[PDB]
Amino acid sequence: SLLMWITQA
Amino acid sequence: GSHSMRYFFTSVSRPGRGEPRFIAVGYVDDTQFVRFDSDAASQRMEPRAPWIEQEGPEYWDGETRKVKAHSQTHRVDLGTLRGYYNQSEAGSHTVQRMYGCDVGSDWRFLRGYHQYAYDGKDYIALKEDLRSWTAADMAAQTTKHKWEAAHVAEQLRAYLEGTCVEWLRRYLENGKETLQRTDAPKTHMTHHAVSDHEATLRCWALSFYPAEITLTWQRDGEDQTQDTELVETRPAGDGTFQKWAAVVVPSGQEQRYTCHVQHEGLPKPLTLRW
Amino acid sequence: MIQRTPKIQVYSRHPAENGKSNFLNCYVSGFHPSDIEVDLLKNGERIEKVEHSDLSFSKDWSFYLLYYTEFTPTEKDEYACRVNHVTLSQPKIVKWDRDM
Structure with a gap:
């Protein structure tokens, strides 16, 4: 299961 | 023996031609179980291993939503990194991301990892302890400072030590008929x-x-x-x-x-x- | 903006045996950028019943794809893999070899 969200760089 | 779950993400910009091509893939050891393709017709996270179908409808709603969220972040980073490296908005640039976790024979956490690349070269990565960052150059540093103030490390750690493993065990159980062969x-x-x-x-x-x-x-x-x-x-x-x-x-x-x-x-x- | 030339390998899924259905593979790897053209040729002419796996990559960020298509090996039919890439000035061809 994927991360719930990836933060922008 | 040891097992791992890994996700692979690839974004390629097409300035003027279309949305950046986004392709994500998921693996359990050497078996790919899910995939997404912004060029496909479903626009949903799709299955690539028989046993993944054991999952319910809310699994697909959830993974589709999360994967689109990934695409949305990668889309912004393409722009963001373009500026950072002061490059023209005309050329095609690539962003790659990988992350996952490893477990022993007892299926307990061994290691976690999250790596980011820009054009085929390390850009930034979460070190072993899952609490610090390795920045490639000046550009990466700015992201690092941004990711520290934001505690991205803490989030990634929680996911890598918990959720990641939990799910890996789960797929391992459902895929036993094959994954463990x-x-x-x-x-x-x-x-x-x-x-x-x-x-x-x-x-x-x-x-x-x-x-x-x-x-x-x-x-x-x-x-x-x-x-x-x-x-x-x-x-x-x-x-x-x-x-x-x-x-x-x-x-x-x-x-x-x-x-x-x-x-x-x-x-x-x-x-x-x- | 580094670039990596693709590695090519044209092989079959199972051990070749004329007259019996099998799959022709063309595994390309180590290239970058991902933009790449790959074709499977049967006696010089391309095949359109060709599929490929989802784009993935190695630890060094180099990409790899597997192009394949069902087929039946014979004695007069020759195959290969036509591969084109930004790092190549000429579409490279690698004829299929059974014992390899």
């Missing part, structure tokens, strides 16, 4: 005259899983690693893998050479003589 290689050797006095011996390892394997040639029991040809392990397309290693030996001296095959699907390694 090990297909030992069907091996054989080929002897074909090359010169008038030389002969080529090629060691073959076929139909094996996982892909991990070692093929080393020896002469009189000594490793011969400087007169051989080794091919990159390759996908058979039916779930198994293939690989071969060959050496050029003086014709008549073949009996001196042996090929050793290491594969966890094998009780003990194999020795082969022409």
Whole structure:
């Protein structure tokens, strides 16, 4: 299961 | 034995032609189980392994939503990194991301990892302790400072030590019928005259899983690693893998050479003589 | 903006045997950027019944794809893999070889 969200760089 | 779950993300910009092409893929060891393609018709996270279908409808709603969220972030980063490296908005640039976790034979956390790349070169990555960052250059540094103030590390750690593993166990259980299997290689050797006095011996390892394997040639029991040809392990397309290693030996001296095959699907390694 | 030339390998899924259905693979790897053209040729002419796996990559960020298509090996039919890439000035061809 994927991360719930990836933060922008 | 040890097992891992890994996700792979690739964004490629197409300034003026369309949305950046986004492609994500998920793996459990060497078995791909899910995929997404912004160019496909479903626009949903899709299945790529029979056992994933054991999941319910809310699984697909959730993974689709999360994967689109990933695409949305990658889309912004393409822009963001463009500015950082002060590049023209015309050319195509790539962003790659990978992350996942490893578990022992008891299926407990061993390690977690999250890596980011820009155009095929390290950009930033979460170090081993899962609490610090490795920045490639000046640009990366700015992201790092931003990711520290934002505690991205803490989030990634929670996911990598908990959720990641939890799910890996889960897929492992549902995929036991296959994921936990090990297909030992069907091996054989080929002897074909090359010169008038030389002969080529090629060691073959076929139909094996996982892909991990070692093929080393020896002469009189000594490793011969400087007169051989080794091919990159390759996908058979039916779930198994293939690989071969060959050496050029003086014709008549073949009996001196042996090929050793290491594969966890094998009780003990194999020795082969022409 | 580094670039990596693709490695090519044209092999079959199962051990070749004329007259019996099998799959022709063309595994390309180590290239970058991902933009790449790959074709499977049967006697010089391309095949359109060709599929490929989802784009993925190795630890070094180099990409790899597997192009494949069902087929039946014979004695008069020759195959290969036509591969084109930004790092190549000429579409490279690698004829299929059974014992390899």
